[PDB]
Write a protein that binds this ligand. Structure first.
Ligand SMILES: NC(=O)c1ccc[n+]([C@@H]2O[C@H](COP(=O)([O-])OP(=O)(O)OC[C@H]3O[C@@H](n4cnc5c(N)ncnc54)[C@H](OP(=O)(O)O)[C@@H]3O)[C@@H](O)[C@H]2O)c1
Lengths: 76, 145, 48, 554, 48, 96
């Protein structure tokens, strides 16, 4: 609820520490889920689309495919 | 239909020759290539057809003579009227050659279809020319075969 | 013609050519020998 | 080299929804007057594009016009209402479903004829053997005897399955298996290193793979996996939904032109460049989009001069710029821009040639280069762009290319740069070696000899065919091969077996020109001999008086 | 040692011991041994 | 101009060539297709377009001068690297 665009980005540039916290997170997201949260934060897109390209492209969609949701029927 | 609260003058004039809104085939538009006059025109002719009863899926071929002739300030309506009387007598409905790419706005007007090339038909029964002018000067005429 | 077909017919061209003043009718001697019909408005010459 | 790109001159065509109802209502009357007879492949085609743009609102419009069709007036009207309701049903089952490029045209071939008056004409006559594209796909894949599996290619593909058998049948000791591929490799290396001492068919359309000794040898595995999709295309079509692509050299009546319509029938958004940006050219591409633009598609035409370094980098920027550009990212790049440098040997590499070489190579590379850095910078890491390199079979075999071959050959260094340099996952390279396309293009006068050369058991292509073939390598199957490995793709009609092709052609070239010249020569001679014998008067009074058309204003 | 290749001779004498060993081992279905022979012959044709 | 000095009888050194050894070349180290710069385009022009023109020039010289029976042997410096190495930058393209 309290989220606002470009939050903690000022502190980002100014703090070599926080700088890296974000980076490691982004680095992660990009290489696994195929997007940057830093981007989403800086400029809030009304939409965004990830692409399952070559070698590291396919490995991403794997993670999208390996997302296990769970709802049981009214019989059990 | 003269002053009948239960008959639109459009209905009237048409029904007196045994026709309904569905028989109204071509609408010649003022369509002056200005931003607003072209939204508006569609919107009016559209609301017109809808509220009268025009059956969904039956579009009017829309003509825009101005692409070819330019806008002769006053004689605009006359040129268009000629066009329709001519369509009436040939069954050919001329296309808007300069229809680059119709504005997405014009999608919401179901009852109007904007032809970019001429179409030879089995015939047209009745048409509607419509022009608008400076100082809230709107006119419309319906012609029957 | 233009609004519908997108080009002039010979009939069209002749009308345009007439009103634009490019050709005019002639009915007398052209260079001695008689002639009647379309003539280039600019040069007295005849046109088919 | 004068820049020509200007974002203000950009034209965007995207109004499929309207052109639909038009092409729809247009076809309806077409039938009623018999412009369309149920026969005509045409109707099929039209219907598919109407299917491609399927709205709910289209159906309503579709329906009403049918529902009220006055069948009681004539056959046509019935025939209409029939095919109408027919179409309406199809459209219903393809809502949401990706639009498709499906070439329903009637495969056509080359046929030059010499009239008895010496008149030389060239029609394109339906191929007696194929009727649908599926037939073409087969005819191609099958092969021609003229392409008889060579000794080496046989020795190899055989030793292959020998291993495949010996291998995938585990009951021999690993002492022997281990020592089999030993004696197996031996054979392969010896064959490559000194073929001279040691020593069915080939597609017409095959891929290749590189040997340890960088050799592009026919690979059935690929040629299969390709040709398969190539067939799957001819059947249930092929979609390009969601794809973005840049195309240069998509002039009116060119290979590019056809490929364009292809992607436009899939849901593809493409940016097309023109170096002769006219109204006429503007209109042309509109004409296309009006009739090809499936739901979701978009055409963006733009002036551009690939001879201009500046333009190149400028174009690319318009393409990617989020704010004032059209903010895309490219899926395909089809660099078909090219100049006719006919007539020049090394004798004389002139202005034109140096220019041409700059369009066809230096700036082409820079075009790819530009796109890459764009992606690199924009963090676009997982969406490589497939580049359809138009390579050639002529690497100096033909006469006065004048810097042509030099360009087309150089392009092939890319096959390796894809590996060495660091742009592998931004651009993928698909080396399409385009073969003889008789379609009116950069090989036009080469149509007289089109059927002649084809006599020798080899095949020439129409443009729609070549576009099909190319769009083939555009298909998902192959696209993924490219993402791991550059693709060679011999789309030559097997002319790889007719040697001294330029000699053959010029030979035929002569005969046709010669025999026709003689024929019409004699005609003059004899009809002149008549003026001598019968006199001016007799001859004069006995010639077909062909009335000169006048005009009457009714 | 890098640019090594085998004479036509070695190519055959190696095809020999390959066949001889694989064959005089009899572990293969009459299918495999059938078409192994098949393929061998072709190879031996093309190589003369 | 060079070629003409070579062949001109009067004011040139009026030769006819037996060998041509076009080893003119520029180090375009450091550039991928990433960035074909000024240098690269220039290098490619020295290493290919003008090279061909050099040969071409010599030929027409002979053809015109009736030098029919004395071909000139051209030692084309080709390369093993056709894009196998990194940052040739238009090098391979010329050599191929
Ligand atoms: N057909 C074959 O047998 C064959 C064989 C090998 C390779 N190819 C390749 O096929 C591709 C397409 O060419 P084509 O042979 O199909 O037809 P083409 O007649 O060579 O088409 C050339 C097109 O390139 C564009 N163009 C010309 N000069 C340009 C310039 N200075 N800047 C930007 N664009 C320019 C023109 O488009 P605009 O009119 O819009 O300006 C023109 O329509 C080429 O890359 C060619 O090398 C074809």
């Amino acid at each position: 609820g309290s989220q606002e665009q470009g939050m903690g980005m000022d502190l980002y540039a100014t703090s070599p520490v926080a700088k890296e916290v974000w980076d490691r997170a982004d680095k992660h997201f990009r290489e696994n889920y195929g997007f940057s949260i830093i981007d989403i934060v800086k400029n809030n897109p009304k939409e965004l689309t990830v692409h399952f390209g070559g070698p590291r492209g396919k490995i991403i969609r794997q993670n999208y495919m390996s997302m296990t949701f769970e709802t049981v029927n009214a019989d059990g | 239909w003269r002053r009948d609260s239960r008959i639109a003058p459009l209905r009237g004039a048409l029904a007196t020759w045994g026709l309904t809104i569905d028989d109204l085939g071509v609408a010649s538009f003022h369509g002056t290539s200005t931003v607003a006059n072209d939204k508006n025109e569609s919107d009016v002719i559209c609301q017109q057809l809808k509220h009268l009863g025009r059956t969904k899926g039956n579009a009017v071929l829309g003509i825009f003579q101005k692409y070819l002739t330019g806008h002769p300030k006053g004689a605009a309506g006359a040129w268009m009227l000629n066009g329709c009387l001519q369509v009436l007598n040939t069954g050919i409905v001329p296309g808007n050659r300069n229809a680059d790419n119709v504005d997405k706005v014009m999608e919401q007007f179901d009852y109007i279809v904007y032809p970019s090339r001429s179409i030879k038909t089995d015939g047209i029964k009745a048409f509607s020319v419509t022009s608008f002018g400076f100082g809230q000067k709107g006119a419309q005429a319906i012609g029957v075969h | 013609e233009m609004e519908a077909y997108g080009k002039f017919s010979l009939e069209g061209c002749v009308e345009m050519a007439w009103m634009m003043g490019l050709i005019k009718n002639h009915n007398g001697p052209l260079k001695g020998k008689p002639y009647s019909g379309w003539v280039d408005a600019k040069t007295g010459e005849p046109v088919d | 080299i004068e820049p020509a790109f200007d974002p203000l001159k950009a034209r965007v065509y995207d109004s499929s929804w309207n052109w639909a109802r038009q092409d729809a209502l247009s076809m309806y009357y077409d039938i009623i007057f018999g412009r369309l007879r149920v026969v005509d492949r045409e109707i099929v085609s039209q219907c598919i594009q109407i299917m491609n743009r399927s709205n709910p609102l289209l159906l309503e419009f579709m329906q009403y016009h049918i529902d009220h069709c006055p069948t009681e007036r004539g056959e046509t009207y019935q025939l209409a209402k029939e095919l109408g309701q027919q179409l309406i049903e199809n459209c219903k089952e393809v809502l949401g479903k990706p639009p498709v490029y499906k070439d329903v045209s009637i495969p056509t071939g080359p046929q030059t004829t010499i009239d008895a008056r010496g008149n030389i004409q060239y029609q394109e006559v339906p191929r007696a053997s194929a009727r649908k594209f599926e037939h073409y796909v087969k005819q191609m894949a099958e092969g021609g005897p003229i392409s008889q599996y060579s000794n080496r290619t046989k020795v190899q593909n055989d030793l292959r399955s020998v291993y495949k058998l010996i291998r995938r049948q585990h009951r021999l000791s690993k002492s022997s298996q281990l020592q089999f591929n030993a004696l197996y490799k031996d054979v392969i290396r010896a064959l490559a290193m000194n073929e001279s001492q040691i020593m069915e068919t080939i597609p017409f359309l095959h891929l290749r793979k590189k040997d340890e000794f960088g050799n592009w040898e026919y690979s059935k595995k690929l040629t299969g996996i390709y040709l398969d999709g190539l067939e799957a295309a001819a059947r249930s079509g092929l979609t390009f939904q969601g794809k973005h692509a840049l195309m240069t050299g998509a002039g009116a009546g060119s290979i590019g032109a056809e490929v364009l319509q292809g992607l436009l029938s899939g849901g593809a958004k493409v940016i097309v460049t023109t170096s002769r940006f006219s109204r006429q050219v503007t209109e042309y591409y509109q004409g296309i989009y009006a009739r090809c633009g499936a739901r979701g598609s978009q055409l963006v035409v733009v002036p551009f001069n690939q001879g201009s370094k500046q333009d190149v980098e400028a174009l690319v920027n318009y393409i990617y710029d989020t704010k004032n550009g059209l903010g895309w990212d490219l899926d395909y790049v089809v660099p078909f821009a090219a100049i006719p440098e006919n007539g020049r040997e090394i004798d004389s590499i002139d202005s034109k040639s140096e220019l041409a070489h700059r369009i066809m190579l230096t700036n082409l590379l820079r075009l790819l280069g530009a796109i890459k850095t764009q992606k690199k910078e924009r963090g676009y890491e997982t969406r490589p762009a497939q580049v359809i390199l138009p390579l050639s079979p002529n690497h100096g075999t033909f006469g006065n290319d004048g810097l042509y071959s030099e360009s087309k050959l150089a392009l092939e260094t890319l096959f390796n740069r894809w590996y060495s340099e660091s742009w592998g996952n931004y651009l993928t390279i698909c080396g399409a070696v385009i073969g003889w396309t008789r379609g009116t293009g950069l090989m036009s006068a080469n149509n007289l000899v089109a059927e002649g050369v084809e006599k020798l058991g080899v095949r020439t292509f129409s443009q729609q065919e070549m576009a099909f073939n190319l769009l083939g390598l555009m298909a998902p199957a192959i696209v993924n091969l490219c993402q791991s490995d550059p693709v060679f793709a011999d789309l030559n009609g097997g002319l790889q077996f007719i040697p001294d092709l330029k000699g053959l052609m010029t030979k035929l070239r002569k005969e046709i020109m010669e025999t026709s010249a003689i024929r019409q020569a004699v005609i003059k001679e004899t009809a002149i001999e008549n003026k001598v014998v019968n006199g001016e008067d007799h001859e004069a009074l006995y010639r077909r008086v062909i009335t000169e058309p006048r005009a009457n204003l009714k």
